[PDB]
Design a protein around this ligand. Structure first.
Ligand SMILES: *C(=C)C1=C(C)[C@@H](Cc2[nH]c(/C=C3N=C(/C=C4\NC(=O)[C@H](C)[C@H]4CC)C(C)=C\3CCC(=O)O)c(CCC(=O)O)c2C)NC1=O
Ligand SMILES: *C(=C)C1=C(C)[C@@H](Cc2[nH]c(/C=C3N=C(/C=C4\NC(=O)[C@H](C)[C@H]4CC)C(C)=C\3CCC(=O)O)c(CCC(=O)O)c2C)NC1=O
Ligand SMILES: *[C@@H](C)[C@H]1/C(=C/C2=NC(=C\c3[nH]c(C[C@H]4NC(=O)C(C=C)=C4C)c(C)c3CCC(=O)O)/C(CCC(=O)O)=C2C)NC(=O)[C@@H]1C
Ligand SMILES: *[C@H](C)[C@H]1/C(=C/C2=NC(=C\c3[nH]c(C[C@H]4NC(=O)C(C=C)=C4C)c(C)c3CCC(=O)O)/C(CCC(=O)O)=C2C)NC(=O)[C@@H]1C
Ligand SMILES: *[C@H](C)[C@H]1/C(=C/C2=NC(=C\c3[nH]c(C[C@H]4NC(=O)C(C=C)=C4C)c(C)c3CCC(=O)O)/C(CCC(=O)O)=C2C)NC(=O)[C@@H]1C
Ligand SMILES: C=CC1=C(C)[C@@H](Cc2[nH]c(/C=C3N=C(/C=C4\NC(=O)[C@H](C)[C@H]4CC)C(C)=C\3CCC(=O)O)c(CCC(=O)O)c2C)NC1=O
Ligand SMILES: C=CC1=C(C)[C@@H](Cc2[nH]c(/C=C3N=C(/C=C4\NC(=O)[C@H](C)[C@H]4CC)C(C)=C\3CCC(=O)O)c(CCC(=O)O)c2C)NC1=O
Ligand SMILES: C=CC1=C(C)[C@@H](Cc2[nH]c(/C=C3N=C(/C=C4\NC(=O)[C@H](C)[C@H]4CC)C(C)=C\3CCC(=O)O)c(CCC(=O)O)c2C)NC1=O
Ligand SMILES: C=CC1=C(C)[C@@H](Cc2[nH]c(/C=C3N=C(/C=C4\NC(=O)[C@H](C)[C@H]4CC)C(C)=C\3CCC(=O)O)c(CCC(=O)O)c2C)NC1=O
Ligand SMILES: C=CC1=C(C)[C@@H](Cc2[nH]c(/C=C3N=C(/C=C4\NC(=O)[C@H](C)[C@H]4CC)C(C)=C\3CCC(=O)O)c(CCC(=O)O)c2C)NC1=O
Ligand SMILES: C=CC1=C(C)[C@@H](Cc2[nH]c(/C=C3N=C(/C=C4\NC(=O)[C@H](C)[C@H]4CC)C(C)=C\3CCC(=O)O)c(CCC(=O)O)c2C)NC1=O
Ligand SMILES: C=CC1=C(C)[C@@H](Cc2[nH]c(/C=C3N=C(/C=C4\NC(=O)[C@H](C)[C@H]4CC)C(C)=C\3CCC(=O)O)c(CCC(=O)O)c2C)NC1=O
Ligand SMILES: C=CC1=C(C)[C@@H](Cc2[nH]c(/C=C3N=C(/C=C4\NC(=O)[C@H](C)[C@H]4CC)C(C)=C\3CCC(=O)O)c(CCC(=O)O)c2C)NC1=O
Ligand SMILES: CCC1=C(C)/C(=C/C2=NC(=C\c3[nH]c(/C=C4\NC(=O)[C@H](C)[C@H]4CC)c(C)c3CCC(=O)O)/C(CCC(=O)O)=C2C)NC1=O
Lengths: 113, 248, 162, 164, 177, 164, 177, 164
């Protein structure tokens, strides 16, 4: 009883890595949010792609621009939503990794190269 | 030096307004008026004697030290007059062990704890060479007394934050109890007798009993014992890409 | 496990005989060779995280395409760099084990047995690890027989990779 | 697994007799109540990470002393395993909503739990307080249907009475 | 307190033995790397503030419960004190590295620290993490392995000094455990 | 806790005397003015997600450089941290408006703020800009009665002074 | 230390919750009887010496062994010492009644008092009797039920305040038990 | 009661045989160690109210959350029964120091305690923390002799390992 979405994604993992490129990691699935924490440390798919290793030397001044162009927004304005009494926070720290989704990415649509 | 609990979890210290009037062209200091001087003396009695419940038959002998104090505002000479009285010696020198008297002086006149065995030895030598009054004169005319309290404030147990050694903090909390804790619970038998000469530390519960309000006192105690083992040689590794190294 | 001790025992047990003077001399050679190998193990232990970081940087400088090409086998992302540093640390740990043990016993058991299977399936080129081991041989900063003993276990791994 | 089918085939096997009319009569009620308990289980399955997050902070809000040193919730490794164990209990409750009985609870979460929680210094009152908070935040028409809420709170009370 | 030269002196005094030529290889070798130790200590004390501010922030990074209400490091007072604790540890390990002996650490630091933290309710594990971050960047600076912060040195190996300072941080870590 | 009651009873404790009528007179002073000073209690309580909204963005607009690389606001969740860190000050001015004195603020937000704001390199000018924004964003006729606005501003500029 | 307004503030800080209009009925009702509490505290402190002098004498009344040689209250020193304590406990319960919170009672007076009495050999049961006599005449004065000592008040019920001060004396009684 | 005599007469009664030399040999050691354990028990008997008071406040100092409402230490009736139960455990330890074995502990305090403390919501960690505090405040020369301290701490560790 498979689906079209699943089969299309899984078929990219049948090609050799030297050909498949990023798609060679397409057989991995989302896992319960606590599997990504300290003891288990399951890896997400965004950690196998060059997007997680981008640390360029150049930077944007963020001062050259005339006042009124830079925009800032938070995720919320609340003490115990940004960080609960416990350490389980989605916005501060290293616990923003412990989320149910976000375990895989749909960035394998770009190309096989 | 931040005193994370000196002036926010604890009141401000008490004493004379300021030392500029001591320069004295027409008066020695602004007449704090007799009603803000009786509370100063009440504060001093609660400190140098440390809640000794002194009756007025026994406060009829401290009349002369008081009568000079309200006339000439130096606080340090007031406590120098108090600690040499029979009211001080009969309570702290008469029934007690030696290092008990020595350690009580650190609580009363310096507001801290003895940091080492050598300090106690130096006090012992200084007592043996001719009197106990020399002990009190060394403490009162000390440098440490000048750069902590001076001639203006009552000597109080200050939380320094930046202690010269940590055991000084532990032993400050053990001598200072809670309120409604006095200094004739044990009949002599100083609390730091063993721990000074040995070098170990004190009970966690009795230190936590003397902490101020709202300081999450006592918590965080693992259920196995508290004193560490000097002879332990644990292995703890770091994290390397290839493996773990026990850089010890 | 290939030590000078266990091979002497294996040669005595193959005849089913007691330990002759042949085996005792083979063990004595280990004992007056061990003093420099234990110094080499101490020195390679002390310089470990510096050497691993330098070896990874030397591999990235020699082969810059490994930091650029997308794919799981390359160190283009962060987990790839972490696994590359983990592999270089594995190689250095096997070299130190062979130094303290006194032969190519640990790394024969742990590294080269079934090694090219992994490089063929995971598609990781052995020339990268050769380039890392050449940096470690050139940059450990040892002298005398300490250097002669550490280098001799380094190029054994190089010879098996080639 | 303790369920409707297994109880009656185990009783008929202990007696050594064929399935009679009372056994089949017991399965008609399974057919009846599966319309409520399955759509309770599905609604629990579709929104479980919100409930596990919501009930996890009630434990540390009620017992803030667990984050002190010396306790069982010091660093992030303990809090992550706390959320993991709460998610385990919610998954077992989802399983018991499906099987129709308390089998998966009684064998995968309850049996042996007391020795573990006493040995590993885990206070059972805070493993209880999350389940207690989950029960009280259940309104009758909003979260599920009326009988689904009864079916859900019954297994929650079973877990609470087992750990207390 | 003691140093490297006063170590061997008290060791030999327990035997009533003169300090002869056999015992002076250790000290004369200690004098050989004398410039190395001086080259290491200013490298460490030269980054003292950045190391502490990085260390407590790293502590907080994987333990966000310390910021939370009721956390031991909740309000600005407690950050200030916790900031103070890092400098006290770092200064004493620098003293010990300079003297070549840890006889100043556990008498004027670790000695009576675990109980102070127990009474104050300071979490031990997070403090041990803060100490280990400081440890790792101590070795990073001694070995000139820091990603930035290129310091000019003389060429050679300082690995032994790195292991020395790691051993000093070890006993701070084990003293409060 | 610097309150009107804690001043007088601490004074009586230091003097070792019973509470006299000079002491009771101050609590009478509280009796009058709580109504005005707690009227702003709702106004801050129910409207607080909006004031931090307008305050943090004003802070970041007045000092645009702070988002540059190497500054405090270089990524996202640091900006969220900033907004939290002003939320804390709003929560403390509400507490102080309730107690009657500057008790909560000067021991929970002010005490030791110095080192924290220097060692983490956080410019205090940015905090005072955001606070002074809300100090004059207030309107006397629309926002409160006349006297709540006086005392709210008197508490705000308290910390606007200490931070300076 | 804390008071009634600083109670709810720290309770809400544990939740990181603002003090909203729902929590202010308790405090606004606390302000409603504000004049009642002031009318009660001077009534109590107005008879402070007589209450203590009556309390210790009542203690002695049914325990004549305290006067006897070897009694804890034998000589004039010990009467004087004991006499202080009746007034001192009374001062702290008056402080607590005034503040509306016993946070300045079990942190400034009752902390460590049981051990102090145990070390000094003070009998607990007789002291509990002295505290209870003081308790009963505290309610007598608050409710204007004293046989003599007619005090002018405003008409109404002060029974809640009577219950409050009885609860404060209760924790003194239980602290040394 | 589990003791030295009772174990060997129960073994000889199970075997159905007379007391042999090994049985009497086991009583010579009772004669030996009674010189230490009896003067441990006497020193515990003479100063027990100081120890029960001293170990009672360590429980609430470590766990201050018990005095909150909804917990097991709300009013004075709970704290008084807490001190009473700690005194009960110290009395049973005094009894085991006298009888020579763990009989009075195993039957009057340990057997059945887990069901009571789970049912009545009593956290066992705080019934343990007082016994743990009592063990660490022992100096053999200062409090008792050297072997008396060993004999005392052995029964304290037995009670701790039984409740944990
Ligand atoms: C939270 C998730 C988190 C942080 C906050 C941050 C803190 C942190 N940083 C390191 C690693 C280093 N710190 C260094 C210190 C400095 N670099 C400088 O240029 C100045 C002089 C100084 C202070 C600003 C350096 C050089 C490093 C690189 C590693 C090294 O030691 O050289 C860590 C890791 C701790 C460790 O193991 O070293 C942490 C936690 N990083 C975060 O992840
Ligand atoms: C010994 C057998 C014995 C006593 C000595 C004496 C002490 C005592 N008195 C009471 C009852 C009261 N005490 C009161 C106090 C005062 N009355 C005043 O007019 C002034 C202001 C003040 C001090 C002189 C009052 C008013 C009473 C009546 C009861 C009340 O509370 O109002 C007791 C009983 C204690 C009690 O339960 O209240 C004792 C022991 N009485 C003796 O029997
Ligand atoms: C009048 C003297 C001012 C002025 C006031 C206006 N404020 C407006 C909106 C607004 N104001 C605030 C801050 C204020 N509201 C509060 O609830 C509190 C504290 C409890 C304060 C200090 C906020 C947060 C907002 C946005 C939400 C809202 O609209 O209420 C407003 C409407 C238009 C506008 O945005 O300005 C006015 C007129 N405005 C003035 O021009 C003078 C200086
Ligand atoms: C011990 C390692 C230290 C030391 C500790 C101190 N104990 C002090 C008082 C104290 N301790 C106990 C517990 C212990 N003593 C007993 O008699 C019994 C049981 C029979 C036990 C478990 C008690 C009961 C007391 C109070 C009575 C007393 O004075 O002994 C103490 C005084 C200060 C304090 O109250 O803690 C200290 C310093 N003393 C030492 O000499 C070694 C080094
Ligand atoms: C920060 C990384 C820690 C942490 C630190 C806190 N320490 C607090 C008070 C405090 N710390 C010490 C030890 C320190 N003082 C010294 O003299 C020496 C060595 C010579 C050291 C290491 C002492 C003695 C004290 C008390 C001094 C006093 O204030 O009287 C503290 C205050 C909390 C509060 O009560 O509000 C904090 C936060 N806490 C942490 O969670 C991390 C692990
Ligand atoms: C060791 C010897 C010795 C003394 C003799 C006294 C001397 C003396 N008297 C007073 C202080 C005083 N002395 C007097 C005494 C008198 N006023 C008169 O008009 C009468 C002539 C006389 C009583 C017979 C008064 C009335 C005051 C205080 C006046 C005031 O300031 O209100 C003070 C100030 C002390 C103080 O309060 O700080 C001193 C030192 N004290 C001593 O230590
Ligand atoms: C009031 C009564 C009273 C005493 C009895 C002494 C007891 C005493 N002796 C020493 C301290 C000492 N006491 C001795 C004594 C001896 N060592 C031996 O082997 C011999 C048995 C004995 C001499 C006959 C020594 C040798 C030291 C110091 C040892 C050292 O630490 O170097 C100290 C420590 C004081 C200090 O230095 O700080 C004290 C309190 N002091 C007093 O106040
Ligand atoms: C399939 C069924 C199933 C379960 C129901 C759970 C049951 C369970 N929970 C924990 C384990 C735990 N449970 C908690 C939770 C808490 N402790 C606290 O401080 C708070 C009171 C509370 C947070 C909610 C913690 C901290 C641990 C880890 C204990 C430890 O490792 O020290 C463990 C120990 C192993 C581990 O998780 O590491 C087990 C078996 N696991 C299962 O496999
Ligand atoms: C499948 C398991 C499941 C539960 C245990 C509950 C629990 C629950 N409640 C809410 C969320 C909510 N729950 C309520 C509560 C109520 N609203 C009303 O109309 C009633 C009067 C009252 C219940 C008595 C309110 C007002 C919210 C939104 C605010 C909040 O987050 O609490 C949420 C967040 C998602 C949502 O918006 O619903 C969840 C998971 N709901 C579930 O789906
Ligand atoms: C008063 C302050 C004071 C100092 C700071 C030092 C400064 C200093 N360092 C060295 C000298 C040195 N410093 C180093 C250290 C290193 N070389 C490296 O490449 C490593 C990165 C790093 C390891 C820590 C080495 C290897 C030498 C030469 C060996 C030696 O002199 O012992 C020398 C002697 C030779 C030279 O001038 O360089 C001096 C004066 N001495 C002082 O008196
Ligand atoms: C701020 C809080 C505070 C208190 C509550 C008291 C508590 C207290 N009481 C006494 C001291 C005393 N307390 C009493 C009183 C009594 N004993 C009895 O037999 C009666 C039941 C009772 C009288 C009603 C006695 C008799 C003494 C002196 C005992 C002695 O001679 O040692 C002492 C020490 C004695 C001294 O130093 O002189 C202290 C600290 N003091 C305080 O600082
Ligand atoms: C500065 C010192 C200071 C005080 C002493 C009080 C004085 C005081 N008490 C009350 C007022 C009152 N006092 C009482 C109390 C009582 N009425 C009875 O018949 C009972 C016997 C007794 C109970 C204790 C009552 C019932 C009121 C009126 C209700 C109220 O005002 O809340 C009032 C307001 C109305 C009035 O003036 O009477 C004042 C000012 N207030 C202060 O500011
Ligand atoms: C002869 C052997 C023997 C014992 C060992 C004890 C064991 C014991 N303790 C308690 C009972 C208790 N033990 C505690 C103690 C505590 N709860 C807390 O909040 C803290 C964790 C801790 C304080 C130290 C409390 C509060 C009760 C009473 C429980 C209740 O009635 O709700 C009870 C219930 C009956 C009762 O005491 O009312 C029993 C049987 N009793 C015995 O007869
Ligand atoms: C016993 C000793 C031991 C060795 C030798 C070893 C090698 C090893 N390296 C692997 C992967 C890897 N190795 C690398 C390393 C590199 N690739 C590069 O581009 C860099 C140039 C180079 C780092 C210097 C990378 C990026 C992977 C992940 C490849 C993948 O998952 O497809 C894997 C696949 C399993 C895994 O995902 O971890 C093995 C088994 N493992 C061992 O246990």
């Amino acid at each position: 009883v498979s689906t079209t979405k699943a089969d299309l994604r899984y078929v990219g993992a049948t090609k050799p890595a030297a050909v498949g490129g990023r798609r060679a990691m397409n057989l991995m699935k989302q896992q319960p949010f606590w599997m990504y924490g300290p003891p288990y440390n399951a890896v997400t798919q965004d950690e196998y792609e060059p997007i997680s290793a981008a640390a360029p030397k150049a930077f944007v001044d963020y001062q050259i621009f005339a006042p009124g162009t830079v925009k800032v927004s938070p995720d919320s304005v609340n003490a115990n939503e940004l960080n609960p009494v416990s350490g389980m926070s989605k916005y501060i720290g290293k616990t923003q990794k412990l989320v149910g989704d976000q375990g895989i990415s749909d960035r394998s649509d770009k190309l096989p190269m | 030096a931040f005193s994370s609990i000196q002036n926010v979890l604890t009141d401000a210290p008490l004493g004379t307004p300021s030392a500029m009037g001591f320069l004295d062209e027409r008066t020695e200091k602004p007449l704090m008026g007799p009603s803000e001087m009786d509370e100063l003396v009440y504060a001093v009695y609660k400190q140098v004697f440390g809640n000794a419940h002194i009756m007025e038959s026994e406060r009829a002998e401290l009349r002369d030290a008081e009568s000079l104090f309200r006339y000439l505002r130096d606080v340090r000479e007031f406590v120098r007059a108090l600690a040499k009285s029979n009211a001080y010696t009969s309570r702290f020198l008469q029934g007690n062990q030696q290092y008990r008297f020595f350690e009580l002086n650190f609580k009363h006149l310096l507001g801290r704890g003895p940091r080492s065995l050598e300090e106690m030895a130096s006090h012992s030598a200084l007592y043996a060479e001719g009197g106990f009054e020399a002990v009190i004169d060394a403490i009162l005319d000390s440098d440490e007394y000048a750069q902590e309290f001076g001639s203006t404030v009552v000597p109080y147990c200050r939380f320094k934050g930046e202690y010269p050694t940590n055991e000084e903090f532990n032993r400050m909390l053990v001598l200072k109890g809670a309120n409604s804790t006095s200094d004739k619970a044990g009949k002599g038998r100083s609390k730091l007798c063993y721990s000074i000469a040995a070098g170990c530390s004190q009970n966690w519960l009795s230190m936590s009993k003397a902490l101020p309000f709202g300081t999450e006192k006592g918590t965080g105690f693992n259920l196995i014992s508290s004193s560490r083992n000097p002879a332990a040689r644990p292995r703890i590794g770091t994290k390397i890409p290839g493996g773990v190294v026990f850089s010890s | 496990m290939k030590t000078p001790i266990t091979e002497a025992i294996a040669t005595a047990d193959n005849q089913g005989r007691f330990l002759s003077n042949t085996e005792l001399q083979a063990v004595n050679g280990r004992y007056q060779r061990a003093t420099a190998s234990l110094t080499a193990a101490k020195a390679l232990t002390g310089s470990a995280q510096r050497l691993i970081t330098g070896a990874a940087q030397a591999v990235y400088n020699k082969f810059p395409y490994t930091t650029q090409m997308p794919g799981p086998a390359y160190a283009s992302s962060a987990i790839g760099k972490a696994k590359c540093a983990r592999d270089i640390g594995y190689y250095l740990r096997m070299v130190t084990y062979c130094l303290v043990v006194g032969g190519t016993g640990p790394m024969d058991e742990y590294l080269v047995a079934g090694l090219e299977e992994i490089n063929r399936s995971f598609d990781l080129s052995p020339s990268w690890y050769i380039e890392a081991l050449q940096y470690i041989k050139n940059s450990h900063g040892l002298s005398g027989q300490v250097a002669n003993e550490a280098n001799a276990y380094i190029d054994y791994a190089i010879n098996t990779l080639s | 697994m303790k369920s409707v089918i297994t109880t009656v085939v185990s009783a008929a096997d202990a007696a050594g007799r064929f399935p009679s009319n009372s056994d089949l009569e017991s399965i008609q009620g399974n057919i009846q109540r599966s319309a409520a308990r399955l759509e309770a289980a599905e609604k629990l399955a579709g929104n479980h990470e919100a409930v596990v997050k919501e009930a996890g902070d009630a434990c540390f809000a009620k017992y803030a002393y667990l984050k002190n040193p010396g306790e069982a919730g010091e660093n992030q490794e303990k809090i992550n395993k706390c959320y993991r164990d709460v998610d385990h209990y919610m998954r077992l409750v989802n399983y018991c909503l499906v099987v129709g009985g308390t089998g998966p609870l009684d064998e995968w979460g309850i049996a042996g739990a007391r020795e573990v929680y006493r040995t590993l210094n885990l206070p059972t009152s805070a493993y209880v307080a999350s389940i207690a908070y989950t029960r009280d935040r259940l309104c009758v028409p909003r979260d599920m249907s009326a009988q689904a809420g009864v079916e859900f709170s019954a297994y929650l009370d079973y877990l609470i009475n087992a750990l207390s | 307190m003691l140093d490297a030269f006063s170590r061997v002196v008290v060791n030999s005094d327990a035997k009533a033995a003169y300090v002869g030529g056999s015992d002076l290889q250790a000290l004369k070798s200690f004098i050989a790397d004398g410039n190395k130790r001086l080259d290491a200590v200013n490298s460490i004390v030269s980054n003292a503030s950045c190391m502490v501010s990085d260390a407590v922030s790293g502590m907080i990074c994987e333990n966000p419960g310390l910021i939370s209400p009721g956390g031991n490091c909740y309000t600005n007072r407690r950050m200030a004190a916790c900031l103070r604790d890092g400098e006290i540890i770092l200064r004493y390990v620098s003293y010990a590295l300079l003297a070549g002996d840890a006889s100043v650490l556990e008498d004027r630091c670790l000695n009576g620290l675990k109980e102070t933290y127990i009474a104050l309710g300071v979490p031990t594990n997070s403090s041990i993490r803060a100490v280990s971050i400081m440890k790792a960047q101590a070795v990073a600076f001694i070995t000139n392995t820091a990603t930035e912060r290129k310091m000019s040195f003389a060429a050679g190996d300082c690995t032994s000094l790195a292991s020395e300072v790691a051993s000093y941080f070890d006993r701070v870590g084990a003293a409060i455990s």
